[PDB]
Amino acid sequence: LEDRRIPGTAEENLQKSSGGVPGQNTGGQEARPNYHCQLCFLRSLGIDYLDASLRKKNKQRLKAIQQGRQPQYLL
Question: Which residue segments constitute the domains of the chain, with CATH numbers given?
Fold first, then answer.
């Protein structure tokens, strides 16, 4: 019986890396909003808010900010 589907570790086992690219940009039409300039504020809210747009990776960055800083996958 081969059932290697263990959630939170077997799918994690595939490469076991620290993520990489989220794919939340498209290029436009689907995303990339900017009409009343508030979306342009979201484009540069002191830029730590764009760390906000991507905090899914920063929930660990507290130690990765002082890590070896590998090829952008580490962050």
Answer: 1-75 (4.10.210.10)
Tokens of 59: 């929930």
Please give the Cα distance from 1 to 53 (Å, whole number): 42
Could you give the C-alpha distances from 56 to 21, 31, 53, 61, 66, in angstroms and in order? Answer: 11, 18, 8, 9, 18
Find where tokens 């952008």 sit.
72
Q: Around Cβ 20, how many Cβ atoms within 10 Å?
A: 13
- Residue listed under structure tokens 């580490």: 74
Q: Do the beta carbons of residue 7 and residue 14 sit within 8 Å?
A: no
Rounded CA-CA distance 55/64 in Å is 13
Report CA torsion sign: 68, 69, 70, 73. Answer: positive
Dist CA 17 CA 72 (whole Å):
12
26's tokens: 């498209």
What's the CA gap between 72 and 19, in Å, rounded?
A: 10
